[PDB]
Design a protein around this nucleic acid. Structure first.
Lengths: 322, 322
DNA sequence: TATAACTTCGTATAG
DNA sequence: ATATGCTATACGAAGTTAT
DNA sequence: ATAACTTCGTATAGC
DNA sequence: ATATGCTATACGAAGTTAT
């Protein structure tokens, strides 16, 4: 009892060992665990094998994906392994349930999804539809869609871009010094170049936003219902908003969502990555050159984004078709 | 305890099982650690996790790299584990703070650097200049640089080359047999072949040096101020010296180093290794080949040596501007 | 003799 | 090569603020 | 009121 | 990415020795 008390103390002391996103995910499973526990009358700490087993089967019946269920058992294991208690994973029962749960769900046809592709053809359409709009928020959203599809950057990354990071490269095109790595052995930063057109799109946004009045202002900002931008160097556009620009843009062209509870029915924050990656493959860009685009050090993700491309059908098809 | 003393005694007895450098650092750390303990009135062995934690934060606060801080923790770990005692990393306090130290440092931008590349052009330009020198020193250096780039061998392996290790192909190309490297203790050994041009550079050195006088002579040796090579079958040219060749060569082409005090402002011992790896990548050379070339067994290391090839390629810009 | 060209060595940091 | 597991995106919805 | 976000909570993709 | 375990390089400072 003392030993766990101390180990809990360790964690909050070096709570910085993890990102707030992680902690938030940890607290979410405890609340879930604790609530299922009190409800079913089981001590939630230290968790017992059968109880955990019973909970995991409950998450499965709850319709949660295998990775989600693994994430629940995961955190639960952290807590225990960290404190002086054994991890439920080391128990025969839990080990067995996850196993059957895994294949039962795979058997049912569970598949990992990914963002709906936002391709050049999509960008062209949007660009056309909104090219001549004078609406501030529209100008912002086109520039965003340009940078996002052009740079393949992630949403949290586009969010952090300040004005002082935009340099002018050859031809007048824009260059954005950005940071897309978070490991010791990696590249501290990269420079992203924008085509002539996309640079023009962003040029208009900044001109109609005033984000440039102060270099420390983030490229993208809030635009209120009056169509009036709200520059700032301290607060940035949330990633939810950036996700909003994608969904909203999808509605513009396809109207209300395809209902259903399904995910990726409209565009999301990773849609441009999936799209740029596939156009690059379609254009025959050197596989590594594609990795540079998105910052991949392996081809695992890019192979998923282009899995259905005819250029990736394989040897057997190549042989059969001579 | 008596076993502890015994295990340490065993360790020391079979010192040769470990590299001289491992021992070197084991003692340097113990020097750091024991000084901190003394300055804080603590027992330096066995170490108490809470104490080791304060030590690490002390190191991070002294402005040391994550890798050097992980080094100090690693030596304490080996020491304790070899002693039959629990490793500091075994405790929550120590494991959490390390993750925290690393996280924060990386978050603020720390990146493990790598040697300034010495590529094909740097070699051509250097050869083109030193090619005409008659000085024994110059002839040795050029040959050294040539083997470094051609074989990618680390400076400690180049310095262990004995004249008897050199062979030749019927094509008239030199083959240098290498037995032990940083990552390999085998009797199998590999044959590192040199190009016709590089064999030539190596020949001129052998001829003007006289190391061939005895096959058990190290291929490389010192060259005193009067131009007389001092062969030896018991003493190799120090790796510290081989590093000086790279630095002096860089100073040749670009003058005296910056006064920033930073590392890698001039070519160093690993410059040709990373530079050649990057040249092959650029060349479109398959990973198994680059692997063979550098004596790498894993693919991650290669990508690690390539790590800084990550730059704008203009792949998307070209795609959008058409 | 002065000194080029090392060598040895310790702390720091990459592979 | 596979996990494992930390961290980011997903997205419906509640909370918030200036038109 | 309500556009346009932001802040949440928690599922699930990406390293 | 990541945590072992450990082996090698980076580089300024100071000591060495045939010229």
């Amino acid at each position: 009892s003392d030993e766990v008390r101390k180990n809990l103390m360790d964690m909050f002391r070096d709570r910085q060992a993890f990102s707030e996103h992680t902690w938030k995910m940890l607290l979410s499973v405890c609340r879930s665990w604790a609530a299922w526990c009190k409800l079913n009358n089981r001590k939630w700490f230290p968790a017992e094998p059968e109880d955990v087993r019973d909970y995991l089967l409950y998450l499965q019946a709850r319709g949660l994906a295998v990775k989600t269920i693994q994430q629940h058992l995961g955190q639960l294991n952290m807590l225990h392994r960290r404190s002086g208690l054994p991890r439920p994973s080391d128990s025969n029962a839990v080990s067995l349930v996850m196993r059957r749960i895994r294949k039962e769900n795979v058997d049912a046809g569970e598949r990992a999804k990914q963002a709906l592709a936002f391709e050049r053809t999509d960008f062209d359409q949007v660009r056309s539809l909104m090219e001549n709009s004078d609406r501030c928020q529209d100008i912002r959203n086109l520039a965003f869609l340009g940078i996002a599809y052009n740079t393949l950057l992630r949403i949290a990354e586009i969010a952090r871009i300040r004005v002082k990071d935009i340099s002018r490269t050859d031809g007048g095109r824009m260059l954005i010094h950005i940071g897309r790595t978070k490991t010791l052995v990696s590249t501290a930063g990269v420079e992203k170049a924008l085509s002539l057109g996309v640079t023009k799109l962003v040029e208009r946004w900044i001109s109609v936003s005033g984000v440039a009045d102060d270099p420390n202002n983030y490229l993208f900002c809030r635009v209120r219902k009056n169509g009036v931008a709200a520059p700032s160097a301290t607060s940035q556009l949330s990633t939810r908003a950036l996700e909003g620009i994608f969904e909203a843009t999808h509605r513009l062209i396809y109207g209300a969502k395809d209902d259903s509870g399904q995910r990726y029915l409209a565009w999301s924050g990773h849609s441009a990555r999936v799209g740029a990656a596939r156009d690059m493959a379609r254009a025959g860009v050197s596989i590594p050159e594609i990795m540079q685009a998105g910052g991949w050090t392996n081809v695992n993700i890019v192979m998923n984004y282009i899995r259905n491309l005819d250029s990736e059908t394989g040897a057997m098809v190549r042989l059969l078709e001579d």
